[PDB]
Symmetry: D2
């Protein structure tokens, strides 16, 4: 497993529901953002523009342990491990300010697809970026 990467996410009105906490599907959005920052979003845009390759989530196993509130700045904490040429495993967690446990945990499995939905190996330049 890699080191832990950190990405802040602020909770705005778009993120909450009428129950007073973050609406749960939004956590996968925050996890997506955080993976982009590990990879480098400019490299993702170049890879898609120039080669029509992009990544897809194959599996996501989520645990929602605590409610996250409006105006919190949470830390998305991410690590990755390579699992062969095709798969990347991500551990991602949402931590509320000062918390002693993750509010949300995800174990995510990612693949790389072309525009025909065929699996492709993770490009070396992406892996380089991820490990830089």
């Amino acid at each position: 497993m890699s080191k832990i990467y950190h990405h802040p996410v602020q909770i705005y009105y778009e993120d909450t529901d009428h129950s007073g906490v973050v609406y749960h599907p939004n956590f996968l959005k925050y996890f997506e953002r955080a993976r982009e920052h590990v990879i480098d979003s400019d490299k993702l845009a170049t890879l898609w523009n120039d080669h029509g390759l992009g990544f897809a989530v194959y599996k996501a196993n989520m645990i929602f342990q605590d409610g996250v509130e409006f105006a919190e700045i949470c830390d998305i904490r991410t690590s990755f491990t390579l699992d062969g040429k095709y798969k990347t495993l991500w551990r991602q967690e949402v931590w509320r300010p000062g918390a002693s446990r993750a509010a949300v945990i995800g174990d995510i499995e990612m693949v790389c697809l072309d525009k025909e939905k065929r699996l492709q190996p993770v490009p070396a330049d992406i892996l380089a970026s991820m490990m830089a």
Copy 2:
């Protein structure tokens, strides 16, 4: 102006914020859905797949007059008028169940663009569908 078209929208947890009403940007989503139903979404998909044409909102003038609540089934009420070969004007309103006034009003101006963001005339088959 055309007749009024009706499209129901149910308000789920994804639609509300912690203030207890629908989060205002979502109303433009509902208006988008309702326009698709006037046009025929299958025709929109064929037009984009086969010709790379699609529509874009150029202007949206919104009035938010009342809060919409969880579990309401609202009526999106839409009419259109053609304004030359390029522009379509839409009047769209969200009506809460039993209400005597619209909760949300939009005056929307739509154009048709190719993939290079060039303005194109509204295709006759789209206009036919809209007026069918």
Copy 3:
């Protein structure tokens, strides 16, 4: 496990991303809608308005097997099983038109919380509604 319930979901511009398929976090929204229709959304609104009880997803294990496209009307197929007084297990699947396999699978575990985030038994009136 209950019978399979069916809930249609149409894919609009709000649902897709620039890769040309549904953006994966949105599937959990569709699953949420479908659970509301099993439960009865009016009962959920009365339970929250009158008693300040509502449901929360504790776990969601997702498999994303195929990309879903613009203008498809998918079928969300849902079943539930009770697992004691506190937990409800849901199996939910997105089926593209005419498909021979689910595009998306979720195994969801749901709890019932009060406003203090304390676990509560599923109310009998909710269970009645679910089994009606």
Copy 4:
């Protein structure tokens, strides 16, 4: 009119649609975030938690002049002017990197409501924060 405030927004997969640009309703989300940063989101949370006051958009007049693309970091540029005790007028613009014109323009009118949807004057502490 106040000075111009700046708030960056990065465009992720959640922001785009299959046409390859930002899905237009999302711009109002970015405008909402930017207003929170002018006001101070902690003050908004305290005002809602302690007094049950919050702000609402009454009017939004939007112009969408250019498409915004994946992985861009745009600048949301905001100014405000007070229009009596009840209303606040906001001018908000999305600027793509290096652009010579705004991609999106909004003229937004904001009010302050209690939980009964009654109009209230903008609290002095909010105005202080806004002008700090």
